[PDB]
Design a protein around this ligand. Structure first.
Ligand SMILES: C[C@@H](Oc1ccc2[nH]nc(/C=C/c3cnn(CCO)c3)c2c1)c1c(Cl)cncc1Cl
Length: 266
C-alpha cells in the first residue's frame, strides 16, 4: 500500500528465499539467501530470516511490528532488523538469523543422559537475556511472554530475544495473571522462570502440576524448588524474581550486575 524507507528498503532481486522456520501467530518465517546485506562487499552472501504473510488484519500487526524494530535500533542481545521489502507488493521483513534456532530447544538437545553445556555457558545464556531485557525496558519497549522459547541462539552462542512492543500461564506473574496488568516488574518475574528453564536444561516449569490451582499454590508462597546442581546464588536470584510484591522484585539493571559478578567468577 504505502511508502518506502531508503534506510531499510531492500531490492527483492538480491533475495532468494528458502525453507521455512515454523511459526506463527503473526506470520510465517522462512530461511532466505539474501545477497549484499552488508554493502561493503556487494558480492557477499549470508543466511537471513524473512517474515511473510500466509493469507488480513495481520497486515496491520505485521507493519506495526516492522515500524517498532526500526525505532529501537540495533542491539546485540535482540533480534535486529536488517531490511524490508514493500516495493513490488508482498511484504517481506528481513532480520538476523540464529541457526541453532531457539533456546528451550537449544538445551533439550545438548541435554546429557539423566544424571558441552558447562555451567559458565549457562550463565552466559542468562546474562545475555538480562542485558537484552534491560535494553527493551530503557527504550520504553516491553516483551510479555519471555520464555526460553522466545530467546534465539545465534551460531556463536549469542542470545537474541525475539519479538517486542511498546494461555502461557506458568510464565505469567500474578498481577498479569489476575489483574491483567504488565509492568517492567512482570517481566522480571518471567525472567526468573527463564532462569529456572535454563538450569534445569530445558525443563517444564512447575513439573506435574495442572495449570489450574497453580494460582492458589503461589497464593501460599510456594515457588519451585532449587533445581539440582544449581548453586544457591542463582536460586536465590529466582526467589527474588518470584517475590509477590513487585517493588521487592529486582530491576533488570540489578539482574545484570548479579549475573555479571557471577560470570566474573572465572
Ligand atoms: C517462529 C520462529 O520465528 C523466527 C524469527 C526469527 C528467526 N531468526 N532465525 C530463526 C531460526 C529458527 C530455527 C533455527 N533452527 N531451527 C530448527 C528447529 O527445529 C529453527 C528465526 C525464527 C521462531 C522459532 Cl522457529 C523458534 N523460536 C522462536 C521463534 Cl519466534
Amino acid at each position: 500500500d504505502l511508502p518506502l524507507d531508503p534506510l531499510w528498503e531492500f531490492p527483492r532481486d538480491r533475495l532468494v528465499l528458502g525453507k521455512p522456520l515454523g511459526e506463527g501467530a503473526f506470520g510465517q518465517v522462512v530461511r532466505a539467501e539474501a545477497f549484499g546485506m552488508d554493502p561493503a562487499r556487494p558480492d557477499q552472501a549470508s543466511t537471513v530470516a524473512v517474515k511473510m504473510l500466509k493469507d488480513d488484519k495481520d497486515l496491520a500487526d505485521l507493519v506495526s511490528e516492522m515500524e517498532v524494530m526500526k525505532l529501537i535500533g540495533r542491539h546485540k542481545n535482540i533480534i535486529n532488523l536488517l531490511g524490508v521489502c514493500t516495493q513490488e507488493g508482498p511484504l517481506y521483513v528481513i532480520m538476523e538469523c540464529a541457526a541453532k534456532g531457539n533456546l528451550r530447544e537449544f538445551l533439550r538437545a545438548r541435554r546429557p543422559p539423566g544424571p558441552p553445556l558447562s555451567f559458565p555457558v549457562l550463565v552466559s545464556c542468562a546474562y545475555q537475556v538480562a542485558r537484552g531485557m534491560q535494553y527493551l525496558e530503557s527504550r520504553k519497549c516491553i516483551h510479555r511472554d519471555l520464555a526460553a522459547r522466545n530467546v534465539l541462539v545465534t551460531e556463536d552462542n549469542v542470545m537474541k530475544i525475539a519479538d517486542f512492543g511498546l494461555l502461557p500461564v506458568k510464565w505469567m506473574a500474578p498481577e498479569a495473571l489476575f489483574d491483567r496488568v504488565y509492568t517492567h516488574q512482570s517481566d522480571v518475574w518471567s525472567f526468573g522462570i527463564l532462569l529456572w528453564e535454563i538450569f534445569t536444561l530445558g525443563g517444564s516449569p512447575y513439573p506435574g502440576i495442572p495449570v489450574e490451582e497453580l494460582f492458589s499454590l503461589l497464593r501460599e508462597g510456594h515457588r519451585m524448588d532449587r533445581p539440582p546442581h544449581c548453586p544457591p546464588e542463582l536460586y536465590g536470584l529466582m526467589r527474588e524474581c518470584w517475590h509477590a510484591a513487585p517493588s521487592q522484585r529486582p530491576t533488570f539493571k540489578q539482574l545484570v550486575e548479579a549475573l555479571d559478578k557471577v560470570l566474573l567468577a572465572v
